[PDB]
Each structure stands twice: as C-alpha cells, then as structure tokens.
Amino acid sequence: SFANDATFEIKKCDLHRLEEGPPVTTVLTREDGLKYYRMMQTVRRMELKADQLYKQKIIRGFCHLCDGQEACCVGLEAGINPTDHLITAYRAHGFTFTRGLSVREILAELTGRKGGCAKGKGGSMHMYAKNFYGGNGIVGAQVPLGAGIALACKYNGKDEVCLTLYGDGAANQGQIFEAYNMAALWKLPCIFICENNRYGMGTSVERAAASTDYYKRGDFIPGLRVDGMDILCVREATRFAAAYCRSGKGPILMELQTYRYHGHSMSDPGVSYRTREEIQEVRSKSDPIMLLKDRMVNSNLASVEELKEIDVEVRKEIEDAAQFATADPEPPLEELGYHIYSSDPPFEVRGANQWIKFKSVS
Amino acid sequence: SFANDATFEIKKCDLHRLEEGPPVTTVLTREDGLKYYRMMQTVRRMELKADQLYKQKIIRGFCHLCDGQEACCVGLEAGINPTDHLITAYRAHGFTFTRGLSVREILAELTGRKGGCAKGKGGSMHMYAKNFYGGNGIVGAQVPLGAGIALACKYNGKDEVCLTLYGDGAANQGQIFEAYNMAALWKLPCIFICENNRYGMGTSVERAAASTDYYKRGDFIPGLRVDGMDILCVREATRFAAAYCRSGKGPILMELQTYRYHGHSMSDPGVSYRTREEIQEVRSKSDPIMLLKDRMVNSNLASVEELKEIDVEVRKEIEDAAQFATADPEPPLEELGYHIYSSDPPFEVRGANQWIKFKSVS
Amino acid sequence: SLQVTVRDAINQGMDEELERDEKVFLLGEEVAQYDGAYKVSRGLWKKYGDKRIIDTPISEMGFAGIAVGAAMAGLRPICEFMTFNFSMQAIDQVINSAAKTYYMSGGLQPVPIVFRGPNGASAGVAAQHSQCFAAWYGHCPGLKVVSPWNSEDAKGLIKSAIRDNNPVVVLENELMYGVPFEFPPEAQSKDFLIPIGKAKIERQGTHITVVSHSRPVGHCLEAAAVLSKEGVECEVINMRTIRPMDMETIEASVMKTNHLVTVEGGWPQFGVGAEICARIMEGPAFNFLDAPAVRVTGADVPMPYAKILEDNSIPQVKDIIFAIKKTLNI
Amino acid sequence: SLQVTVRDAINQGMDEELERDEKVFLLGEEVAQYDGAYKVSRGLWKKYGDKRIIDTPISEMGFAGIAVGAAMAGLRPICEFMTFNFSMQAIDQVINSAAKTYYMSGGLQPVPIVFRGPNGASAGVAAQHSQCFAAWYGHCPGLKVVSPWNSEDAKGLIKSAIRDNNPVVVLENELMYGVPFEFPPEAQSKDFLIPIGKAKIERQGTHITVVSHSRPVGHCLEAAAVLSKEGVECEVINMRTIRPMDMETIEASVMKTNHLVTVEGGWPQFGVGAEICARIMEGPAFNFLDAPAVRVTGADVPMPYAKILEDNSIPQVKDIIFAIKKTLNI
C-alpha cells in the first residue's frame, strides 16, 4: 500500500525585482511522481546509450549529452502545457523526448538513418517537434527566435507562452540583450531561461562573465534563481513564471542551476577544466534522479522495488531503440535535395558537377 | 582688471554603484573660460555653415550636425589629456575639431575636396585624427572598437584611457553589452559614454528602450548621469571618470543628457516627432554657450567686449575655411584606387569595365 | 496616364497583402510613426496600427531573429533593414536561422519571411552605406533573392515574396524610389504578381544580349537607345530574380544574338556577372558566342565620397556602351 | 626532414610571430587554457600568459570589434573564430570596421589584423557548421583572403598574414589539421614566408589545367594520379590566395594545356569557380581554350547530416575525373 500524494519543502528562489516568488511547499501525487521518474530515467539512459553509440562510430560529428540536467527538461515540461512553446540550443536530446518524440526517432536521427525525426538531415543539433522550435547550433541565435515565438503568442491572443532556453556561455551574446529590451518593451509572454551548468564549453562562468548572477542580467526584467537539480523546484518555479507571463506582465528571467556529467561534447573528455572529484560530488549529493527516488521512497509514494522495476523497463526500451537505430537503413541518395523550399513546384539542384542533378521536392 | 578664477555650482550627478560622485562645486579660471568659449563658438559656427553649405548642395549624402551638444565635445576634451583616446559615431564634426583638426580640413572633407582630412574619400561620417578613431557609420560598431582601443591602453601600460561614445538609439545594440562584459571582465580603462539627446533618429527614448536610465544599462558596471548642457558639469564628470579608469578599477558609464537642435540629418526636418516649442525652450533655458557667457560676465572673468571680440575672429576663421572648401579642387580621378592596402607595392584595380584600370598606391 | 513611383508601388503592394492576410505584418526602424526612413511605409501605421506595423529599436540581429521566430510560429512577417549594409549584423539569422531551417528539419518547419530594404549604391553616402549584397545572398541555398527595377517589378515581386512560404530577400534601390513609371491597369489590380525566377526582356534586339538587375537596367535602356541610332540593336534583359536566376531566357537570347554583356552595380570579383558568365560557358549556348562575354560592374574599391570619384565607381551609360562596342568590335 | 601536421605548422607560425613582435596577440574562445578547440593553439598560453593569449566569452561581434580596435590603436591581434560559420555574427566588423577603414581614412589608419579559423565542410557537423566563406570574403575590397592546404601553405600564409599591415582572412580546414607533410628545412625556418597573391603549381602537366584551393587540392592530386595511368597528364594549381587571386599563373597554364577545370568545396553559385571562369573569358587566355571551362563544387544544398548524403554533397575524386573527361572529351 502507498500514499496517494505527499507534501514537500522546496528551496526558496532568489529574487530580482519581485516581491514574492513561487511557493516553498508543493504537492506531488504518486502518479505524477512515477511519470517524472520514468521520464528522467528515460532521458538518462538515452544519453548513456548515445555515448556508447558515438564511441562505436555509429554516431559521428557533434553529440552533446544532457545527463545531470534531467530535472530541467522534465521539470519545465511538468510546469507547462503541450500548447505552450519551447526552444533551446544543441543540447536538446531530453527536450526532444519530453516534447513528444520517441527514443527511436531521436536515436535514429543521431545515427543518421531514414527513420530519424528529420530523415537523417539533421543529426544531434537539429531536431524539431510539435511546438518545439528545435535545437540551434548558433550560440544565442535561438533567444531572439524565442521572443519571436512569444510575439506570435501575444499576436494571436491564445494565452500561450514561450520558453526560451540558453546556457551560461550563451548569456553573453549581444542578441540576447537586444531580445530582453524588445520583449520588455512589447510585454511579450517570454520566459528567458538560463541553464547554468557552470561551464561554457571549457570556460567556467567566473572566466566568462563579470557578473555570475544570470537571473539579474535582464536588468529591467525581473528574474529568479532555481535549483536545477530538483525536479520539484523547477516545476514550481515554472508554473510561477508561466502564470506571470499568462497574466500579461511581460517577460521574466529564470536561472536554472544545474550540471552536466559529460564534457561539452563527445570530443571533450572534460577533465582539463574541472576535477573528477567535483563531478562525483554532484552525482552522489545532487543527482536529480537520486533526489526524486529518495523523496518518493521516504514519503511512501513508491517502493524501492517498484522503481528498480521501472529502471529495468527503461533500459530494455533503450536497448531495443538502439538496435533499431543501428540496423535502420540510411536515407536514399535520391532525396538529398528534398525540402529546400516549402510549397514549391519540384525543381533540380546541381550536385558536385554540372552533370549531377538532384530532384528537389517540397 | 579681472578675477583670475571664479567658483560655480554644478548639478549633482545621479549615481549607479558608486559611493561618491564628482563635486558639485568647481573652479573656472579666466584662461580656461575664454578657451572653452572660443572652442564652443567655433563648433557652433562650423555646424551652422555646414547646414548652409548642404542646402547650396556643396555638401551631399550624409551630414549630421551637433549644434546644441557643444558642452559635450568641448567638455570631454577639457577633462582629458591629448594623449587619451576617443571614438564616437557619425555625429563627429565637433570632436574632430576638439581633437586637433582645423575647420579647413573638416569643411573641405564635407565638401569632398582633396584638401579634406580624408582627401575627400570619407565625407561627413568618416574623419580621423591623432587618437581620434573617427566617426563610424554603423550604429554601435564603435563601442567594441572603443573597448579595443582601451585594451591597447592597458596593453601598453602608459596610463591612457579611452572614451567610447554612442547615442541613446545605439544603447540597445547587442555588441555594446558584449563590450560591457569583457571590459569589466578584463578591467579595461574604457569610459562608455552615452550622449542622450532624447531621440534615436525619429524614435524617442520612451519608444526605443524599456529602461531610459542609460547610466544604469551597464548593470555590473558603475555609472553616472550628467547635465550635458553645462560645460563645467561635463568637464568635472569627465575628470572624475578619467581618474577612476586611470586608478585601474576598470570601465565606467557616463550618461550626458543633452539635446540636438537639428533633425538627426539634413534629410530630416525633425518636426514630426517633436514640437518646435520643445526645441526653442531648450535653446532659451539651457543653451551651453549662453550659460557659460552669463557665468563669465557676471563673475568678472571676462567683459562683453572681449567675448564680442572672440566672436568676430571665429566668424572670420569659419568664413576663410568655407572659401577654402568651396574653391579647393576635387581629388584627381587617377587617385581613385589609392589607399586600399597599407605597406604594399603598387598594383592596378578594376574600374567600371575590364578596360578601365586605376593605379593603387599605399 | 497615372504615374506611379517605385516607392508608391512597394507601398501599394504591402498594403494589399496586409489587408489580405492578418498574419502579415511589418517591422523595422522608423517604419511606423516616422512613415518610413525612405517613406516607403507611409500611411501604413495609420491604417493598421501598433499591432501590424511595428517600430523597432536599432537591434538588427535581435529584430531579424524576432521576425524569423514569428515566421516559424506561423506568422508571415516583413522585416525591413534601413539599408542592406545594416543587414550584416543580422545575416546569421537570415542564413542560419531562416534559409537552412526547412532543409534541416526535413520539411517540418517552413519560414515564411521577407527581408526588404534598399540595397547598393546611393548618392554620396560613402563606403559603409553603398555595398551591394546581391551575390552574397544569391550564394545561399534555401533563400530566394530578387532585385526589382521599375514600379511593376517592385510591386509584383514584393507580393510574390510575401505569398512565398520561404525566406525571400528583396533588394530594393534608394535612387529608384522617387522615379515614376507608367503604371498600367494590370499592375493596379490586387492580384498583380511577378513569378520569382522569371526574367523580362525590356527591349527586343538582335545584335547583343545585355543582362542586368536593379537600377542599371534603366542605364542599359539608355545605352540601347543611343546604339540604335548607329544601327546596333540590343536585347536588354531585366533579371528581376537573382536566385534562382533565369538562365534559360539569357541562353535563348544569346543563341540569337551571338554576344553577351552583363551589367551590375556591385563589386566585380565573385559578383552577379561572374555567375552569369560561368553559366553561359558551361551551357549549350557557349558555341553560339562569337566573342567573349564581358562584365560591366562597379569599381573594385570601397565607395569614395567625392562626386567625381563616386561617379567613376558606378557603371555609367558610356561604360556600358564602350563594353558593347568592344564585343561587337566596332 | 620530419613529418609536420598542418595543425602543428600553423602553431609553429603563430609561435614564431608572437616571439618576434610583442604587439602580436591571440584572442578567441578556448584559445588559451583549453589549448585550442582543435588544439591549434596548444601550449601558447602556457608560454605567453594571460596577456598574449586571451580566452573570450562567446561574443563574436564583441571580440572581433575589440580586436579591430586594438589594431587601430597600433596592436597586431589574431582573432580566431571557432569556425567561420560563427564569423557571420561579426562579419560587419570584418568588412565595415576593418576592410574599408584604410581607404575611407585616406591612408591615415591601417588595420593590421588577422581573422583565422577552420572554414568549410568537416565530418557530420550538418548545415550550420559546414559553410565555406571564400566567395563571400573574396568579394570585398580592402581584404586579403587566403586558404591554405598543406603544412607549407599553412605556416607560410599565417606568417605573411600577420606581418601584413592589413586585414587578412585565413580560411583554414578542420580535416586538414591532422594530415602530416614532409616539412623541408626551408619551411622549418622562422623566416619562412609565402607571398599573399601568388598561386602554386603542385603538379606539372600538359593535357589540362586543374585549379583548386584548400582541402580539395589533395583530391585533385589523387585524380591526376589515376589519370596519369591512362595517359592524361594534369597540371594541378593550388590557389593559396583567394583575393587577390593569381590569374596570371592560371592563364599561362591554360595557354599551355588549352583546357580548364576549377575545384572548390563551397557552394557553386557565385563561388570561387565562377570568378575564375569569368576571368578566363575576359582574359587573354580565352582564345587558347579548346573546350569550355567547367566547375566542380559542393552540391547546391545546405549540408545534410547523414554519411551517404554528405559524401555526395562534397566534390569526390570520381567527380573531378568525370569532369576532366567531359572537358577532354574522352
């Protein structure tokens, strides 16, 4: 027998130009708890499998993993509606999953097969879904885009909001400050979110920003700092920020304090700019899956066995998806030129020489 | 007989992240007073002549006048050394003059003759001098350049500083915020100066920025707001800011609240976004030359006759320069391709067709 | 009867498209309350208001990014750069955020946006304000680039650009804004469109093919008038579209005329003329050239301020006539 | 003597120029403590410290602007873009603040800066990270653009770029970094320079002139090796410099071989090949062609991720051979 729900204390958020922030207690139901655990574990195992596939040369090029930040993508999704919009950068395997795509389609895209979500045209960095305006490879570029999506939300008067995520490294991009100004000036329903994983590739926040209070960079825009290792903190902070935007009070900044277990990308071991002890200290003290597990077990919301069972189902699913991604055939060469233009009559595009022609269909 | 100096009250500066600002009292000497008066009148007469030359079609293209903001360029020069560095945007006729160049070369450049400071290749927006890195036509572009010039100051260790000016319209450029961050991060001797004349071309500050406190836009960089119609106020704020950077505390923002009498450029009457009553009231209550004129006469620093004398010589100087600018020959066509590359042996450059060749000499 | 300037033609175009689709809107500096930096958007803010016609602060990368975002979200924005010299700040949004997105998404995400504004040489604005960007934007897959000349071109292309579900770059011309043209009744109609990708023969001829785009098209027609008095009949082609350009039309023309001369305002190296010439050599019309194809372009220098110098950095009628006479060996 | 990789060659160059002039310095993302994003700047920060080798935030427009400013103030910076795809954010600083200034100033203000970093296609990095910028930067008066291939090119060009008192864009190549070459004693010297603007003949030949730049030069040499066994001898030309390119060398070669094929990695339309072909037509060598000159380029598409697609979006050895055979009609 289990309790149907329980009440938890969550960390208070540091505030900037706000009298009150999100509440410091929240109610978690058993069913919601189980869902969040499964989701986070799914993202986790997917990333670990991607790491395995990259080392076997089945994934090439870029491959940015997000394990350690599972509370972020799952937290944000928990505090928003499917009708809401979200955009981020290249570290988007989790968000792709939380926003609807299957681990099959995500892995098949990473392995560059026809069964991918973009038919293998995209790879790790470029995946799109329902109200998910993708990962973007140009640092900062997605922030104006997000405010643009926010502008459409207000323009259509549908009471939807847009989450626009960027990293600590991105936080120093000029276009972001141009976006603050306009989003504030027009009162756009935009939630600027800075995922702070302490590093911008190989550069720590201390060496990259004169002020490391990312929730304050907005200046005239009000902000708040959240514990990005706590699923429940993020969820509650997100519901607050979304409410703030839905009421028409304009944009707002949200700094998520999180962490990544892998280096920047697969081409970066991540040991030259940080210690192995630092990583281990976060994993044994603040692992987002461990935190949730402890909460649910200690409050009689779920059992240790029930959760280990979920772990087993999730690992198997990931195993089955990886076999599909590895065995699925590459895109047919005849479709190289497809999807250059939308809503256009077919035409032909030049290949490596003038005698090579590829058909282009919308 | 006259007094050797006099003491005047100046407006207190609003502060941002500063314990104390510049004094609210300052001493003006007779010699300095006469000098500042001559300088301000020259810039004024120069701009009035440029407007007249533009309407006679002797000056074409762009021509942004700075009359009304004379207290700024003369003021800033009064608070820095000839060895210090300064860069601004396109409204740079005054600064070109205060940094050393004569009205002859400034006007001859405006009229596009060989006797101009840029040999007629530059025009109104592009004029350069010793430690004057010109006017720049791309809004905002000069701010990173300025932080760059400041970087060289620190790099060479000669204790020089750099003034980096931009307008209120420019203040929302992304690169400016990128410049803030690095300049603070490396403690650059950069004085970011925002000339606030209330308008960005045709867009007032209220319609362009969510926050109209430009001396605070720096966020982590400390700032101060100055009265840009008072020569002495600007001078004192400048000496303070210069001392601050020279002491090695890094960058600092300085907002000069001023006003421009003309409409942004010659192709803009400037009456559709502001009333003439507003312009006339600023001219009758806060004219920078008139304020100084009254101060020096009423405190026995100079006589009405002495100032009337200076006016006559300045008028003569501006007239002699205009005759030079009207009669000076245009650049020779054979020199069209000159000055493309520095330190290179001569070569040939293509003209309108493959049979037109111009010699290019460094 | 009824003279309409290129400026008013563009205004007319955006006005009709704004009324037709509530999802279309205009943004940029001084587009609303100032009535347009070059008066192109005159009366529009009065007619449609704060929601549809939006003044922006001077933040190119920012408001271009916002425009693309709105497009991705289902809106159909019209992003104006005061001149295309200023587009350089936001060119990453144009190429990387807009042009390539549909392809990278595998056809799941279209970007119905239009970037417009005056491009190229003006009068005495010097080096940082005179740059032509036709070749830069024409280089990039996923974009469509057009470059109108007269009033018909401007209105037809601007409406086609808007109705096109892709990023379309409309390179306008400042010196052309004030020039009036006979506006036939067909162009006054709300359904007047010009297909992106089709060239137009402004003058039938048999002796030489003269291809151009934007303002110098008018200069080609002046040159052809002069040469006609000497017995030389030039076939003048107005490109209209830079990408995908209409080589078929040019080829057929050169097949008849046996000669070719391209005329552009931009810099020569890697310019519009270079591609036209490279294509003619590679194509089925090369055997029909009785003389090498030559290029008339602007001078290979940053734009100088001085009048006599600026005059010689831009193709003049005499330079076009000179090149034509060299090819015909007369 | 020894095998030296392109990466180590570039490194050696920057190391020698840094020691020679205290005014030279390097800035960019991860250039210092990370030992370089592609290990090109390895060991430099260790040797020179915070002052000479500067890690910057991700602020392209900002640190490029800062660099140009330092150059105006008398310093000689080396601004690295992690890839030239990211240079688009700062391209206004490269063109408008750096390239045009000496001209606009009337010769009073030189801008001794160098912009370097990997350009063009890599391996599986997709559309926003594969773009070649040779044609874009080669378009602009006031710039010099270079595009090394082997180790000798890399070291010589980087040193010439630095000692040159003007803005030089050094388009490097990621896939070439790891490739070793026999480094002759002359290249080992700290005084080794390669003059900007001079092409190089990598292989003598009499049947056809094959011109290229950067990585595909190596592919042209492979194509010549196969064709040599069939009796066809190709003269392979490594451009080295994109602007001002060395047309004289190409012309002299084409006068001998009577045939021409250009090879580039970038997009075809308005690309490097387009200019070469146009220059051939306008030049004294046009009459020496027995067949039209043709272009081998990357496919006219944004770079796809998948292996089989990416392989066919880039010039392959078989594509160069096929084009050569059409031109020679064998």
Ligand SMILES: Cc1ncc(C[n+]2c([C@@](C)(O)[PH](=O)O)sc(CCOP(=O)(O)OP(=O)(O)O)c2C)c(N)n1
């Ligand atoms: C405008 C721009 N400048 C630099 C880069 C290079 N870069 C990257 C990638 C996507 O290319 P690739 O791994 O080489 S990621 C990256 C660092 C970003 O750091 P953060 O913003 O903190 O992101 P996060 O820690 O979440 O990964 C840079 C500078 C880039 N994309 N875009």
Ligand SMILES: Cc1ncc(C[n+]2c([C@@](C)(O)[PH](=O)O)sc(CCOP(=O)(O)OP(=O)(O)O)c2C)c(N)n1
């Ligand atoms: C990046 C960029 N965006 C827009 C412009 C257009 N512009 C200008 C010029 C120099 O070109 P031209 O008169 O057309 S000036 C200008 C407005 C700047 O206003 P402020 O910064 O307040 O300066 P000020 O009031 O002293 O003129 C704009 C938007 C520009 N240069 N650069």
Ligand SMILES: [Mg+2]
């Ligand atoms: Mg980070």
Ligand SMILES: [Mg+2]
């Ligand atoms: Mg202003």
